[PDB]
């Protein structure tokens, strides 16, 4: 089939992603490039990974990390963005 099955974490990862971004709007309020960037990279990230449980881990992890640790929000921004391309729209490694 695919992996776990016909699973769909699409709905999750979309609003999940914004949980981070809406937070990013607060934190990187003087830098409105971050949020649109994360949006942008997600758009050009392969829709499969974005609809997979793995990305749900990434999101739930990095987003909530950035919530607890605003000081390193960017690292999680960095991760989440790289995460998108690392495992999507370039997925030869995995």
């Amino acid at each position: 089939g695919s992996h776990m099955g016909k699973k769909c974490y699409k709905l999750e990862n979309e609003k999940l992603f914004e949980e981070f971004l809406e937070l990013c709007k607060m934190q990187t309020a003087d830098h409105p490039e971050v949020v649109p960037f994360l949006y942008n990279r997600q758009q050009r990230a392969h829709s499969l990974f974005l609809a997979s449980a793995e990305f749900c881990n990434i999101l739930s992890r990095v987003l909530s990390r950035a919530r607890s640790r605003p000081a390193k929000l960017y690292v999680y921004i960095n991760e989440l963005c790289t995460v998108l391309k690392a495992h999507s729209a370039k997925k030869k490694l995995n």
């Binding site: 990187t28 830098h31 490039e33 971050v34 960037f37 000081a71 390193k72 929000l73 960017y74 690292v75 921004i77 960095n78 991760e79 963005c81 790289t82 391309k85 690392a86 370039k90």
Partner: peptide, 18 residues
């Protein structure tokens, strides 16, 4: 090798204390 700037891709213009 770096086929993307990855984390530094952000660092280019914005970042925190790090």
């Amino acid at each position: 090798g770096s086929q993307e700037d990855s984390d530094s891709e952000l660092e280019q213009y914005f970042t925190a204390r790090w």
